[PDB]
Each structure stands twice: as structure tokens, then as C-alpha cells.
Request: fold
Amino acid sequence: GANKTVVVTTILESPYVMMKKNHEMLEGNERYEGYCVDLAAEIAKHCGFKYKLTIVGDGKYGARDADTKIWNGMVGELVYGKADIAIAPLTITLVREEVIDFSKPFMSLGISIMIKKGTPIESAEDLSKQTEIAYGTLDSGSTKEFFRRSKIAVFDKMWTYMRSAEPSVFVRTTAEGVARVRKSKGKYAYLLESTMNEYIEQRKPCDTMKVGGNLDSKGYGIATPKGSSLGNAVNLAVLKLNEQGLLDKLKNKWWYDKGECGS
Amino acid sequence: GANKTVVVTTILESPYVMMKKNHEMLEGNERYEGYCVDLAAEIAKHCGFKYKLTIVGDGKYGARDADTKIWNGMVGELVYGKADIAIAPLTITLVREEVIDFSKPFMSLGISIMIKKGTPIESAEDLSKQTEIAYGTLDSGSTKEFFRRSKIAVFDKMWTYMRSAEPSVFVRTTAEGVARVRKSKGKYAYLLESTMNEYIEQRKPCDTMKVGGNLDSKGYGIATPKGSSLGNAVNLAVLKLNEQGLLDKLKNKWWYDKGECGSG
Ligand SMILES: Cn1nc(O)c(C[C@H](N)C(=O)O)n1
Ligand SMILES: Cn1nc(O)c(C[C@H](N)C(=O)O)n1
Ligand SMILES: [Cl-]
Ligand SMILES: [Cl-]
Ligand SMILES: [Cl-]
Ligand SMILES: [Li+]
Ligand SMILES: [Li+]
Reply:
């Protein structure tokens, strides 16, 4: 049939998608700026489609309810036919790969630890061996699932603590996790992907840092409904953009050229 | 060959696939050891197939000959139907993705610089701005194509030099590039993926090192012929093995530092 505007699901998560200055009087895609706004424009150009950015209704990345088996987040919007493509920092995982299609990675990353500067923690092992400093993860995504499923002793011990900690150590949005680190006087550390950890380390008031090595090695992919004809062209576009240096340029633009914590 | 046996193409490249000691009295898959030998056994177990390891006939990763337009290397073995799967440090690239299928990555890496210790080079930019120290890449693979196609000023400058350097700065095998660094008294640097660079830096004679950051961010994938029924299960197996920690365990085994250089 005739060309139709592609519905892009994405998530309001800095620096991937942010409200532009003057958004209150702007419409459509012009309301937004950021790494995934730029990436969406590049993918659409290389693939020959028009598109509308739409922020995921529930603000989640995507997980499957263990009881109902219903998917939420951006994954659910693809699974249930509400969006045509997700262009976001959506981690490629086994349980998601089983229900949606993914491009090859457009970013490489791993789970990491964010501390308030001066916190006496250097590693996940350190966190697991003490109780004075609380720690947690984002809800409804791949980091929480990593700990829930891990059979590695250190990560198992961490999950056993996190799942029963009171008050809850889990947060609904990345920003809430950052705030809890910044306000907790060193008594909360946040488990989040290295990409975001590195971004926040370059934002005022420059009071957080990444410690330890990454816990795993994975990637973000552009996602489509399973079997969508759109997947092939999108994947070729990701590989071309990576090989041309454009993805490295975009990361540098939004992470380091715009950094607030000096040169 | 025997029915129901998956033919695996792979490449003799340490520590991915190596001949075992006393391999001459061994037979079949038992001749070989290494990271990709272990990975093949894990993938085959998860996917439920029997398999035969074969070393790629021409010893190449895979490129399309510009004149004949025929694919060589492991890519060619898949394209022309001589193998059912490639399990090797085969880089996921655009031109390869157009002709074969790839799993999600099982290893993440980038192009890097190997020098003989003491060489006054810290970066690709450093290489591009001088002519005393020669430098080159492997033939018939993704690193040479990266420079050939790049429009980044530094990399374009490097390609313009490399393509016309005499004698040739390109080598037929990774080992030959490493040997050239070691024998050239600091007057040759070698452009190769970080995985191998890091492996060699920890091994005797302890005379090479990696300098600078990686030039790109890429991955190795398990490859199958386009549309093969094997691709789906193989991809799910790679993701499961990564999530169980087994890929990191295999890396830590085959990159294990026994202290050949320094204290270990
Ligand atoms: C920074 N950061 N940390 C996380 O856990 C996430 C979400 C993840 N990318 C997903 O897809 O669930 N993002
Ligand atoms: C160490 N190292 N450097 C390279 O260039 C290679 C080959 C590459 N993985 C390909 O697929 O062509 N391997
Ligand atoms: Cl429309
Ligand atoms: Cl022998
Ligand atoms: Cl440039
Ligand atoms: Li999938
Ligand atoms: Li492909």
C-alpha cells in the first residue's frame, strides 16, 4: 500500500531524547532533541521513510509480567502493534529477542556502578560484602533482570539483598536513581548501564562517578516487531552509520562536546 | 560428508583455533583447541547438532575480489555452499551482512595499533603525520576495508599512504603482521583488532604493546548462509551464553596471563 508515517516509540531519557527549549510552542518531532532524535533522522533518511516520534506511554523500557505474561514499555508497544519501530537505548537481551527483532548494536555497554564521589566502594564485590550503603536498579528492564537471573555468587548475593530491602531500592526512572545517589550522602549506590553513568559524570554538579569494571558486555539495538519488513533496511543503516563514523560523532556530540564538568 | 553433520568453517588463529600438541596422532575435531573450539561445542550443544570443524582452505577471513567479484575466505565458504556455519573471529560488517547472516556479537572489539615497545607513536593521528614508521593491515578483511572506505581525515590520509606504499605494507596473516613489528626495530606498526593486540602483549618475547584508543567499536558474529534455518537457534544460543557468563569465562581462560611478561 501507499507509504505511511512510521510510528517510532522512544523514551524521554537524556541525552537520547530531551524536550527542546521552547517545546511548549512546538509540534511533532520538533519538540525533541538528542542522540536518538538525530539517529532517527539518519535511519529514516537512509531507509526512505517519514516518521513520528512518540514517547512510550508508561515510561518503561520493557519487561514481561511473570503472572499475566503481558509486555510493558517500548517492547510492549512493538509486541501489541502500537508502534512500528523503537529507536532508544533498548538493550538486546534473550527474552526480548524471542519476541521482537533487533538490529546489530548501535552502542556497546555494560552494567556499572554509580557512586557519590568519596563513597568507599570500588566494585560489586565491595557492595555485596557490606550493608551500610544501600544499592538498587531501574524497574522494568534488563539490569533488574540481570540480577534476578544471575547465578554468579556476588550478583546472587546482591539480588537477594535488593529484592527484600526496605524501603525499596528500585527506582522508576533513571533520573530518580541519579537523584538518590546525589542526595543520600554516600549511602546509596546505583546500578545502571555504563553509557548513562559516563553521561552523568559530565553533568553538573559533577558529584558522581563510575567505579569498577563493567559487569557484562552487551549492546543497544533498533527494534521492530517480529518479522517486520522494516528490520532489514534498518540494520544495514546501523552498520553503515557505524562504519562511516557517524555513531561515534553523535556520542561525542551529546556526551562530551556538551559536557558541563570541564575539558 | 555424513548426513546431519554441520560443516563449520574456522581459521587457524591463536587463541581462537590452534593445533593441539601431538595433533598428528589425533583425528577430527580433537585436533584443535581454543576459544572458538570451545564456543563451537557450546553452540552445537545448545542447538542440538553434530558438527565437523574445517579450516578455511585459503586462510582468509573474507572479502569480495574487486575484479572477479568472487568472495574468498570463510565468507566465500558460506556464500558458495561449502560450509554451513562459520565460528571464528569474523567481524560483522555491512558488505558481509548483505551476503550472509550473522548472530548478535559474541565479542566486542575495535581496530587498534600495535607497536614495538619504545616506538614514538601514541595514536593513529601520530602515524598519519609522519613517514619514518611504516604501517599496514591484514589483507582480505574488515580492517583493510575500514581504511579504504573511511572519509575521516586521519584515516583517509592513512589509506592514501598505505595503498601505495612500497614494499607492500599489507600482510597475508595476522602472525606475519606481528612478526613484522617485532623484526622492524620500531619502523613498522601494525593495525589489528584489540582482542589480538591484547593477547600478544602478554606473551613472550614481551616486545609489543597496544597504544591509543580503539578506532571503532564493532563485534564478532557467528555467520550462516543467508536464510539458513540454523541462524535463529545459533543467535539465541549466543545471547544465552553471554547472559550465563560463559563467554566472559571463555575469554578469561584463553587470555589467561601466566606471567610470561613481568609478574603475572
Ligand atoms: C542507563 N540504563 N540503565 C538501565 O538499566 C537502563 C535500561 C536498559 N537499557 C533497558 O533496555 O532495560 N538504562
Ligand atoms: C586481529 N585481527 N585484525 C584483523 O583485521 C582481523 C580480521 C577480522 N576479524 C576480519 O573479520 O576480517 N583480526
Ligand atoms: Cl500516514
Ligand atoms: Cl605437535
Ligand atoms: Cl574528519
Ligand atoms: Li528477536
Ligand atoms: Li546479513
